[PDB]
User: What shape does this take?
Amino acid sequence: EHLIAQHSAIKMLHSRVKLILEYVKASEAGEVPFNHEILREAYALCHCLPVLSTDKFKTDFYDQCNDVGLMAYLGTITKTCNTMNQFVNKFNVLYDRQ
Amino acid sequence: FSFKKLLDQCENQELEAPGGIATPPVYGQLLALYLLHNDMNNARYLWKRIPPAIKSANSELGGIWSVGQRIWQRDFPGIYTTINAHQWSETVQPIMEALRDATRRRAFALVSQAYTSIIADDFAAFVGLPVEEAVKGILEQGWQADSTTRMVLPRKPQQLARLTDYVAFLEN
Amino acid sequence: NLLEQFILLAKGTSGSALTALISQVLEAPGVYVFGELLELANVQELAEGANAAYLQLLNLFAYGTYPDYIANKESLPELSTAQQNKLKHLTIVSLASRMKCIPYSVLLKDLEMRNLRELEDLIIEAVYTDIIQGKLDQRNQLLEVDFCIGRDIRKKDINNIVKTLHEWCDGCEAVLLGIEQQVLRANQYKENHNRTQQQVEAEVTNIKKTLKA
Amino acid sequence: TWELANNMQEAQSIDEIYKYDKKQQQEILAAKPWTKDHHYFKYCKISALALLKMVMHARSGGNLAVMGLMLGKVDGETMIIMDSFALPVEGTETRVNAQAAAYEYMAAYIENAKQVGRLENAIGWYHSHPGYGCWLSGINVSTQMLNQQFQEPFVAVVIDPTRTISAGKVNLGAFRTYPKGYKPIEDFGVHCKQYYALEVSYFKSSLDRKLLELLWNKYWVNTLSSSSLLTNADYTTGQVFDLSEKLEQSEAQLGDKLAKATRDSCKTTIEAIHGLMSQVIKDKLFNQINI
Assistant: This one.
């Protein structure tokens, strides 16, 4: 569900970018007239691709990743404990009386 | 980096023997390699393992054990004096230079990490020469220095799969 | 727009009046991208004659930055304060186009300025003109730009634009592929678990069928 | 291939719950399992369509109060509701009385639905509280008394339109009541001993799921710019606190609840890793282009 719901949105963004690239290529070749206004916006969009490549963002992202990793550790450690409890409960009946 | 292959080759050479005791040169090379890798316990037990007869047969093992005893007490200045005191055969020749370089790097790291200001005499004894390594230290790496008291100030120097595996494990 | 308002008068005239019109365009506020003005044949015909300096000035305004008006300062005619301010604003826009965190020292070197207060005032007035959007930071001596208008594009750089877009497309495709693989694996894992559970169930009930005799 | 499973006509137990097993319903009604113990049904599952119909009726009521019925069934320990049906009742925002219009309306609408092909019956009623939380008043308590004591399968629903609109989350509240005699927190009111609360859950069919996902698909900008786990931090902290309390209760019990605690922890961990995965995917897609 999760990896598929946003996959469609990513595909839509891919389609829009592909359409823009096709228009730019057509303008370069000469099929469409040289509209010297859309190309400026295309250049501006091109120059804004590497978004937020600063050190503060990287540190915040790494902190977020570590926090989520710890939150997953606390939660794996309890599923393991629950399986542990079910195993000992089943063991205390088979190989050991009472 | 090439010494690891020699290390394990000597290891399986040692592991089995026609009579349990190998030749003197291989014993000495293995002991020297243990000393080089800064693993003292295995070297000490290997020295304890050597039978007394072959131990006293060759004096090379005596010098190697003297170097090991010097390095065990962590007395840095004496290591350089005891490493070149005697003569070393070609079989153990390329061990001394590597060990000396490793000891120098370890002393450099220890001085840079555990010290904020150290008398130039002690630092120079740690490194090896109180003539030109002080100016080398201040110039090359920019370490601060001050005369009169002779004081130096060293300063210290594939993703989505894991997440989906965690999710699959948690959900099941 | 302003360029449309200043463009229809440039058809019939040529010579000194045309150069005066382009000077007025370069002085008028609001105009910052001279794409259609340079595209006219009348402007391009100025190369042959005694008005090549104005053509060079227009080309420098359209594509070049402030240091380009350093080596050839004596060749071009004198500029008023409005033209110099507009050129400095264009240089700031060009610098902000590449990097999103402009250091103060780089701006001082590039704009040939002597005082930090004057540079900050120039940036403030550029923001007021609404060509770039951002904020200053004196503690780190930085200027952060969240959005800057694209400058003029010549008819040789477009290919490079294509390249960047192509790269983006490729990246998107790559992500898509990975997505599919991941979800597939996930599904398989789930199925496997269920299957083995079912197997165990079969086994135990089979045992029941052979123990209730 | 890209979606792998897809759907031509296949379905699962999700689509199976929409049916009417006449023999099963007859035998559960005849057996009457809930008449023997007070602590019967605790799970109520209501379909989406009923939810939106109730919300629109409450909004169309405005500052005043509205009131209507609901349709569904009962299955084992759980209750199923899948239809909402408004009523033409009027009154002040503090009291509403069902006149003869509603009495002639519910029967007429039931007959019309039966003519259509509908086969469900009345299951309960919903009343909108404009502002004063979600709690049954004295008259509501008496009405629920009489309704659940005469028409044993029943349940009441109370929503808060104003708070739902202002906050952004729905105020659906499903309530059953303890009968008279059985005696064994100021938000719930003053009759907290007489009435209790129930959990709420929702469902939607395979066709409904596909249509909802395809309609919500025109939200791509918010989809890849939401950056969750930064907006639901309070919800996750509350969930972890409740997890700690449940873990303490399970540990005391061991001296089952452990399974419930494990499921809750798994849900919270899955949500957290989903947020991290979306963040990682966004970083890979946007911040790794053009150096």
